[PDB]
Design a binder for this molecule. Structure first.
Ligand code: CLA
Ligand code: CLA
Ligand code: HEM
Ligand code: HEM
Ligand code: FES
Ligand code: FES
Lengths: 138, 202, 27, 286, 168, 32, 27, 35, 202, 138, 286, 23, 168, 32, 33, 27
């Protein structure tokens, strides 16, 4: 379903409009799951009486773990700061790094994949907290 | 009728290729749309004083109509948007989305992730209990290790030299005024710069 | 335990309706 | 003993920091767990297991210093309104067969904060509580939602007495930085038997001390300078452990509608893929 | 083969919109503001110089219609009053101006609530003798709930009309 | 927390999902 | 009890996905 | 308290294949692109 | 610079026939842009709470570097946007810039005016001063002149009973979250629906 | 500038880009006056709220005067409400009313102008709340 | 008299409502104005004219009831910090020639709230105050900005005495709803002369009353039922009037920069129309 | 005095407009 | 005629940018929060337990090692202490290990301060042991004022080491 | 207030402005 | 207190013409076609 | 009074600069 006009580069072949009619299925599907959840497992509350009273864990959002597991690991400094800054900035440079490859496809260049997988392992591994299984152990 | 003739029709076009994970973009977005609504809904009862903050939250839960539900959703959908965005990053990374000419769609992308994480970080502290009040206490100094202005940075984010009175005020402004306008601007670019294709094939 | 003892349930019900609502209009 | 915390910090069993007040006397750490259902309907008798694990084997030095068995204790903080089920609401084996000790409220009224005074042996590495959930319907001061539950479990004698003095169930380091020459470990007589010491450190101030019965000795004469450190053994073999969790006081009413909605969603979706996509024949004609 | 009947979607989008409203219902409810009966206009009997318009506080003080304000009924005025018999009065001239909405003043002279905003002159009981006022001032009760001359929600048929009050 | 694992694996299912079906995906529409 | 269903409703509702899962057809 | 997520995670993964299955299975009982 | 360079050249589009009062549109807009900035700036020191509302305002005046100035501008620029919008209505009206080709730009227009007046009305009450606190007290009942839905309206805008702090809470949400998103939406349509001119010749 | 083929109801004759270079002049000009007036007439800080004391002035900002002068004039009711609602809604209908001159502009049309001027007089007159009784005035 | 307000409501001269406490006794309304410069530099002596107008002509009934002249009074509330200039800072005619009475602070300290006790005649329909503006530099408790000033001007005798009793400078309505038959207006003797009354309303309770000297009578016998209303005159010819305003304590410093900026702006614009438009020759060539 | 200038600065700054005016 | 010199605009846009910064300066200043000057902390009596705090109260139980926090210093929490002879302990440490954000924990055992969050060790007088403990803890003075104890805003020197202060 | 008149006339200058120059504006580019 | 705006208003109107003037006058001393 | 005694001033100054900066580059 893809001929020769205004021909070349990149574009559109088959399934036009009405895919935007399974989208509502996705949206409803997304909502539903978040709704079922909020019910079975709601939120809660905690303090506003004594801020002189330090808790002892500090469980920031789950996705601030790898970064947190870093910040607290290497002796403060800015290496951590600089290091965690390397996550977003380091990314911004990727389409400049792994940027060669045209005719092929994208899953046939290991000096990316390998690196990717590896980095998403460190990430996980670092996903750890309060003297949790500790940076060491694994 | 068809008075509405500010140049219309033939909008019915553009065909697709072969994907299945190319929804993580819209999902994440959806989770956001969900946050904007439920988030907004809470600006009607959430009172951001260091004296009132905590109380208003319970008020929403207990004394308010579905408050417990609007808030519970907001809490989940938040963690879901972030979760979904990461998966979207995977999809993209392992699909080669930031193609030859899409590198700008990818960078505005990384930007969108920093905005999104920021949301959680500021909102996490808003109910002002201990986990949220101490997590902010702990992340406030993080920037002070950066010379030249690292402290200025910290002093500007906490609006002071210690966590309190103004930290919550700036954090609320950031979470409900600033951050929302930024994500809207970058989702705006991110989506518009999608006047290109996407995959590979045979 | 009733994850299946039950999901196996809820799931196939809406499924039966699925595989059947098919026939219904497939005719 | 649990009774000690009540008398020492009568108002609350847990410091503003979250650490339970036991750790003040039982400074050795060991595991601890609380097992409660994700959620319970209101006014329902359910289980709450406070595991305080440790392989039966191994003995601690008792007051006399002789090796003895292990005894467990704890403190449980259920959320507002929860309290143990009335003796008659506790099913047969279900709740009544498993664990049977005495749950004393930290203070008059607090039925949701119980001390497990009773200090069972190797029989209660389990300890089950049959608590009864509140009812926000019959109590307008109680609401549904997810709430927190806290635990402070113990086992093994304490290293400090409410008297301010320490037990023999901990190391008794030396007083002076120097070499000791002998072991003044004589007995005593009757209701007591200390194992004194004869430290030297003659260096100007030639002091000696007193070690109690129970903790073994390792080094002494000829050397053992250090700096008034390590007695010659640590008989402490047990300790405190905490664990937190949460349970949802669920309103079956909330579930129904969420389940109702879910079905409308799945159903509303069915009609979408059915009508939309599958009824694509029109242009599917040309 | 002869399809050409996407005239059913008046069911697909039918049940869809169905889900939409279902989910929108609670959100709308959420925005609708809850019950109550106190919080401010609860039960203390605040004042004008720093006291409490009560009974054994404001029983043996009044005389010719004394005006001091307790609090309010869902956000309104309150008092303890008095008249020509020497005793707090049994009624509550809820002084919420019925014209545009200003707290009216009482004249112990013209014995006419000479509201300043637009000039409504209700009696020393709320009887607007000259406008441009709509209906006389609001009303309530006149007793106690123990130490506090307490009243509460009004539905007792007005006496200046005999028939139902001007807001029952 | 609960979600702790909701996404600890929802994402591993995702990875497998793309890294698996995907390498092998366009790995045949233009392989040999 | 009823709680069992609830999650069997979340686990069972993930079915949303089960629909795209079928989404691919022909055109 | 790990075992609460340990089972919580296994479910997210599997269910995916359970859904995937029914999808495949669904198409099969109506006609799936065999070529 | 390519990567979507395909549109870029779409720039210095096209000219003007006869103007000057035709600057009202952008002026009013400008006054708005000025409000968004100075307004935002105040969310860093303003506290939406009966107790701290009034105090924070004085705090801005005498304590913050230029608070007195950021606020003063906001107060003027506000009264200017409205003033300018009225004049823009004149420009437009007296020149039949609503005739036929463009009437939707005009309606979205009237809408923009209602959004703009609303801004001032909610913001006017934020300093929880007598003029602002009694002006809200007075406009709250205005809508009660309607059946069940005439008081539901009022009950929804004020917070319930009469004028609590929920009034201030809802008024702040409306002034800093809601209204700003609406004007942005309608200024958005109003501007896009523009490829317009009028009254000219050969 | 202007010949034959781009025919319709819209047009661009002379002055392209660089008018958007007097705009900055306008913007600066707008700011300056607002800023100037901001330092000349600094924001006055008013007295605190009190639900018990009310009277002695209170007017609704200003552009609300005409509307306010109305609401308080005619005996409450909804005539006022309905009347003030007539301002925005009544306008939305104008391009439908004074829109019979599509073949010719409605600016010379007096049965517009006259009406416009007239209505902007009432508006004014109503502005100036004016002391209730003698809120007579012209 | 102004002194009366001070003694009656000693803490503040104006009610929470904004109405000044004079209106309690001077229930007749007449004009009032406060004239102060839009803004004054800090530490500057300036003018503040409190106009209390009324054409000299016309007399009010004095205590004795005989027609007499008019005397003025007032209350002025300047913003925090302002107070009258020191006798020596008051320029010649400038401030010293115009108005010269005594400004007594409402209460010890309040130098910004003055009562114009002195009650001048037809000479002071003007009354000028030479006030000295504060300095936020020498006083860190004072800041620049726009602030409010209030006025409560009077003239003509009060209708009510601090004694609780009313003057003869107003109306003395009747006591009964009925027809009076005569005027019991006899004199008295010496230090007093009342003009009693002989109301009837014989209807069961046949009462009569007492009217003082001063207020004239209009109707009486034959009719005049009413309802214990209008005596027969209200000799009241003067009253209270308020006026508010604001002044800006200006920081010449603020002005400079705003004037500096303005010049950069105008200048910055000049360059725009100059370079931009006027240098349009390029295509102006083809 | 200095205040005089200030407004002569507002009235004088209205010049902004005096620039478009040069059209 | 020979124009072609829009090489001046490096002045039009020059002075324009000029206006831009001028207007941007105060906006930026505005965002830099207010500081101190005389340096002093205006207290809302806060307790380590959340209620009103008074002198003789927390100042009396100081036995060998009393360390509980009250309404303290601008971020830095203030401990209340006394020596053995129970005299106004001339030091009150703000458990301020400016390390990674936690409040320095006193030692019921060492009487020193051993931070658990990240391993910082201290002594009795705020004296760090080694590390991750950054430096020696900040000290205070010893005084009371009408059941309302008075310590003062720090910018001053410390005797534990002898040199000018670092923890001002 | 002060602005009371700032716009009471700034707008009248405006009216005249458009109503004047404008009627007479396109009243000659296509008049006779 | 009207006379404060009465003069405040006259200024807005006039200044317009004063500005307009200098604009015209400006163009005139450079070529207005 | 100094509205002109002064605006007439401030105004013509930036004006002189105007009419002159013209010549300056007009040459
Ligand atoms: C080798 C290949 C490799 C690959 C393919 C990846 C891939 C990925 N990593 Mg990762 N990583 C790697 C190696 C790799 N990593 C290594 C070697 C390290 C150790 C040093 C890390 C450490 C790391 C961390 C710590 C994190 C990731 C995360 C992530 C991913 C989620 C994207 C995101 O939302 O980030 C968005 C970015 C963040 C969450 C970091 C916060 C950044 C904020 C504080 C500052 C942003 C500053 C701004 C942009 C800089 C301006 C500078 C100015 C001068 C202009 C992701 C898909 C993130 C994740 O999994 O989150 C749930 C995450 O937190 N990685
Ligand atoms: C012929 C052309 C013409 C034109 C172009 C205009 C133009 C304009 N007129 Mg106007 N007018 C005209 C003729 C005209 N008029 C005539 C003939 C009359 C005589 C009766 C008037 C009488 C008049 C008055 C009395 C007013 C105006 C106002 C206004 C303007 C401000 C618009 C605004 O923001 O209001 C937006 C809305 C409001 C100010 C009122 C808010 C009302 C709320 C309570 C409800 C809004 C309803 C909402 C849509 C929900 C509907 C509910 C349903 C049950 C009804 C405006 C730009 C107003 C003004 O000058 O404001 C500064 C004003 O008060 N005009
Ligand atoms: C899951 C059913 C799903 C798929 C598959 C999918 C695909 C998809 C593609 C291929 C694009 C590219 C569009 C283009 O090039 O013009 C795209 C873009 C957007 N999507 Fe999507 N999408 C799926 C699901 C969803 C859902 C549920 C939403 C939320 C309503 C959503 C949203 C968006 C948005 C926004 C864009 C940008 C579109 C644009 O710029 O035109 N998607 N999606
Ligand atoms: C003042 C010098 C000024 C004038 C005159 C003016 C005119 C104007 C017109 C005639 C249009 C319609 C344009 C067309 O059909 O091509 C128009 C449109 C917009 N304007 Fe404007 N404008 C003046 C000033 C300003 C200022 C200061 C701004 C603010 C940046 C501004 C903005 C806009 C916008 C936005 C549009 C929308 C245009 C579109 O969608 O094509 N104007 N303006
Ligand atoms: S508000 Fe009192 S008469 Fe109108
Ligand atoms: S903050 Fe105390 S040791 Fe890290």
């Amino acid at each position: 379903l893809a001929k020769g006009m205004g021909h070349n580069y990149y574009g559109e072949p088959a399934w036009p409009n009405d895919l935007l009619y399974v989208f509502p299925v996705v949206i409803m599907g997304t909502f539903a799951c978040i709704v079922a959840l909020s019910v079975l497992d709601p939120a809660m509350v905690g303090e506003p009486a004594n801020p002189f009273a330090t808790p002892l864990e500090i469980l920031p959002e789950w996705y601030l773990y790898p970064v947190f597991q870093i910040l607290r690991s290497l002796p403060n400094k800015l290496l951590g700061v600089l290091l965690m800054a390397s996550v977003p900035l380091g990314l911004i440079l990727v389409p400049f790094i792994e940027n060669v490859n045209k005719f092929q496809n994208p899953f046939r260049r290991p000096v990316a994949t390998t690196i990717f997988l590896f980095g998403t392992l460190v990430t996980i591994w670092l996903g750890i907290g309060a003297a949790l299984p500790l940076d060491k152990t694994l | 009728e068809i008075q509405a003739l500010a140049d219309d029709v033939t909008s019915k076009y553009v065909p697709p290729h072969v994907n299945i994970f190319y929804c993580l973009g819209g999902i994440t977005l959806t989770c956001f749309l969900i946050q904007f609504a439920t988030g907004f809904a809470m600006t009607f009862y959430y009172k951001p004083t260091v004296t009132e903050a905590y109380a208003s939250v319970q008020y929403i839960m207990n004394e308010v109509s579905f408050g417990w539900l609007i808030r519970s959703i907001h809490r989940w959908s938040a963690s879901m948007m972030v979760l979904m965005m990461i998966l979207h990053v995977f999809r993209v990374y392992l699909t080669g989305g930031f193609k030859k000419p899409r590198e700008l769609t990818w960078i505005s992308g990384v930007i969108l992730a920093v905005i999104t994480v920021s949301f959680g970080v500021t909102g996490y502290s808003l109910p002002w209990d201990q986990v949220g009040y101490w997590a902010v206490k702990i992340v406030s100094g993080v920037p002070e290790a950066i010379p030249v202005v690292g402290v200025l940075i910290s002093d500007l984010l906490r609006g002071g030299s210690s966590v309190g009175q103004a930290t919550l005020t700036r954090y609320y402004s950031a979470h409900t005024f600033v951050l929302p306008w930024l994500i809207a601007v970058f989702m705006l670019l991110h989506f518009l710069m999608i006047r290109k294709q996407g995959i590979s094939g045979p | 335990i009733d994850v299946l003892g039950w999901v196996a349930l809820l799931v196939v019900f809406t499924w039966s309706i699925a595989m059947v609502v098919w026939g219904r209009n497939g005719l | 003993y649990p009774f000690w915390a009540q008398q020492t910090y009568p108002p609350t069993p847990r410091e503003p920091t979250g650490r339970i007040v036991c750790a003040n006397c039982h400074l050795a750490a060991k595991p601890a767990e609380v097992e409660v259902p994700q959620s319970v309907l209101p006014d329902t008798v359910f289980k709450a297991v406070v595991k305080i694990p440790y392989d039966t084997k191994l003995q601690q030095v008792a007051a006399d210093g002789s090796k003895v068995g292990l005894n467990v204790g704890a403190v449980l903080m259920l959320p507002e309104g929860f309290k143990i089920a009335p003796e008659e609401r506790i099913p047969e084996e279900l709740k009544k067969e498993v664990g049977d000790v005495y749950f004393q409220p930290y203070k008059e009224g607090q039925d949701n904060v119980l001390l497990v005074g009773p200090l069972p042996g190797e029989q209660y590495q389990e300890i089950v509580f049959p608590v009864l959930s509140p009812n926000p319907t019959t109590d307008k001061n109680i609401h549904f939602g997810k709430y927190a539950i806290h635990l402070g479990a113990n086992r093994g004698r304490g290293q400090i007495y409410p008297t301010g003095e320490k037990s023999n169930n901990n190391v008794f380091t030396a007083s002076a930085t120097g070499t000791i020459t002998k072991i003044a470990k004589e007995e005593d007589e009757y209701g007591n038997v200390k194992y004194q010491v004869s430290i030297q450190t003659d260096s100007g101030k030639t002091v000696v001390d007193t070690i109690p019965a129970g903790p073994e000795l390792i080094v002494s004469e000829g050397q053992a300078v250090k700096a008034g450190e390590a007695l010659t053994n640590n008989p402490n073999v047990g300790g405190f452990g905490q664990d937190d969790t949460e349970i949802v006081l669920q309103d079956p009413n909330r579930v129904k509608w969420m389940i109702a909605f879910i079905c409308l969603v799945m159903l509303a979706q069915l009609m979408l893929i059915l009508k939309k996509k599958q009824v694509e024949k029109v242009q599917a004609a040309e | 083969d002869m399809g050409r009947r996407q005239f059913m979607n008046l069911l697909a989008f039918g049940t869809v919109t169905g889900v939409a409203l279902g989910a929108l219902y609670p959100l709308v409810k959420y925005f609708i503001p809850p019950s109550g009966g106190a919080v401010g206009g609860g039960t203390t009997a605040k004042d004008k110089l720093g006291n409490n318009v009560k009974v054994s506080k404001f029983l043996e003080s009044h005389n010719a219609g004394d005006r001091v304000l307790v609090q309010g009924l869902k956000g309104d005025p309150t008092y303890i009053v008095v008249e020509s018999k020497e005793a707090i009065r049994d009624y509550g001239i809820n002084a919420v101006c019925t014209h545009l909405g200003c707290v009216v003043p009482w004249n112990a002279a013209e014995n006419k609530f000479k509201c300043p905003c637009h000039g409504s002159q209700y009696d020393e009981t709320g009887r607007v003798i000259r406008g441009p006022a709509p209906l006389s001032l609001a009303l309530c009760h006149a007793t106690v709930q123990d130490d506090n001359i307490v009243l509460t929600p009004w539905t007792e048929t007005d006496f200046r009309t005999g028939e139902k009050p001007w807001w029952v | 927390m609960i979600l702790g694992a909701v996404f600890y694996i929802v994402f591993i299912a995702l990875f497998f999902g793309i890294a698996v079906g995907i390498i092998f995906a366009i790995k045949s529409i233009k392989l040999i | 009890l009823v709680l069992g269903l609830v999650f069997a409703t979340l686990g069972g509702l993930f079915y949303a996905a089960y629909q795209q899962y079928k989404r691919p057809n022909e055109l | 308290m790990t075992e609460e997520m340990l089972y919580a995670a296994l479910l997210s993964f599997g269910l995916i294949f359970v859904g995937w299955g029914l999808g495949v299975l669904l198409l099969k009982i109506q006609g799936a692109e065999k070529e």
